[model samples]
Target: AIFSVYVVNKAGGLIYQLDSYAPRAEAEKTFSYPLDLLLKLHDERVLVAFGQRDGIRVGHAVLAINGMDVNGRYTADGKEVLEYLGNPANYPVSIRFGRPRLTSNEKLMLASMFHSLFAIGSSSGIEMLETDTFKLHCYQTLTGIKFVVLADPRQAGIDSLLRKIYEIYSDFALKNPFYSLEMPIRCELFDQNLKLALEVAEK
Candidate 1:
């Protein structure tokens, strides 16, 4: 139904990968994949701040400060957010998270790498590349995450497919407690949904 599919994290690492063509991992062992420097996740406790997956709930809010807005700021780069908020003067800074948590004890830690979209030569690098064997389509979110699709280069509308994939990632992966940002996606529901989308795309 699909060829080679991959989701790249902002750091340029793997978030999710499904190789429909190269099914054997043994052949991969000798070569290694592509870029991460080229992906990059988190902890718990202490008000459950991101990297730390706090209890603020998924898809809720991940603000760096009140109205400061870190959504497109590339918070995953670390120090940037901390450096901005860590100064002694910003003591009262508060983070805004999405959804809403219920637990009184087990808190949440998001600190997701919610940064801006990946850059191209326009933003200044590259977005899509293709060869005779296959084509690569990259879809980036404002949160610095990118969804990559490997398919027949002649295929069309795959760019739009990334949007639906993003929606599924948010609906299943983001909402579920297990899904940690910037990490490999292992969500079953996400898998089911993706296959469903791919089935349609497979046509």
Candidate 2:
């Protein structure tokens, strides 16, 4: 039992609709999930975790983001961890831990070569990158913050997942009184909520 009405305009017919019941309106906006997270690029290679949770460990070198090779630009001293969390919103997030797979010189060489692929005329920029082992998805904010995710090749809905991650970041990290912009995330509440959300997604 739901009720609604519609209205139209001269230029565009049916320009508006109003639902008489709260439940119907709520149901109409409902969305699914499975999610991802975010990071800040440093020194061309090292990705300092800006706001992240289970799938990404804070303060590590991101080997790749949405399938673009990152190791070629940055190096770190520790091993990395790979974790995967699933969300219904096409948000499949995964990470793995390991030592730097390439040497500093090798990384520089690759970065130079990789930069050559882009043509000046294209405004859309790189949207996605696919690899044999995984796929990389990336989302950039108006202020130039980047949220990148590495997931299994079979995963889908990465865009939605990344957007959700950015939302979570804005809610918990950006709004927090103690959070500093462009720095590593250290907020306990942000960490807690992120882990909780992913844990819920797992269930």
Candidate 3:
């Protein structure tokens, strides 16, 4: 299963983001809170609770590990953090993330290559792309919105996974009264449901 997800608009802007894994602490220092707790608090701008103790509750914001800013640094949302953690010196195993939307020239080139596969008429649809270390699964809506999932290279059943994702999107995102079409997804239900779905997918 994927450790993180990045949703991009058709125009190549990042709309929604989620991360499931937290960076491991070095031997010299350990965080007061676990990685997940830190991330949840990171979004809320609140004091992170560690066990029963409250430490450093005054700061409104906490810095993400590896100097990655969750807000403004990258169009693809967690790319820098992924890259930071993927480094061999930082972690033993490589971390994976979705291919960013066509935001840069390199990304545009990759998108063009993926689109060119359609001309071959060799497959029914472009479902999965494999690289040396990453497997990218793509799901595109009729309206051109694309949902991409990056997972372990050995993972399978991507088509089914993508369909489940689309179902969740249609239910929680499209049906929400406050959701703006083609905009950043902010629905709590959607987030909650997606996390559950991902958990199931992981199993």
Q: Which number leads on lDDT?
A: 1
Clashes of each: 30, 19, 0
Instruction: Give the CA lDDT, 0 to 100, for residue 141 in model 2.
Output: 52
lDDT by residue for model 3 over 1-203, one digit each (tens)? 56456555555555666655433122122332223232123322223334222333322233344333333233134544424333456543211222222223433334333443332222224456787656766665555555666677887666676677678877775577677656788777778888877877787
Ranking by TM-score: 3, 1, 2
TM-score of each: 0.47, 0.38, 0.51
lDDT of 1 by residue, 111-198 (tens): 1222233243223122566777566666667666667676777886686677888888888764887767877888788888888887
Report the Cα lDDT for candidate 1.
Answer: 0.51
RMSD of each: 19.4, 21.2, 13.5
> What is the per-residue lDDT of model 2 for residues 1-203, given as tens digits with 9 covering 90 to 100?
11221212212122222232221100111112232334444445444355454344455455542333334343232222222122233344333322233333432232232223333232322255566645545444544444444444666555565566567777865477686444555566755665454444333
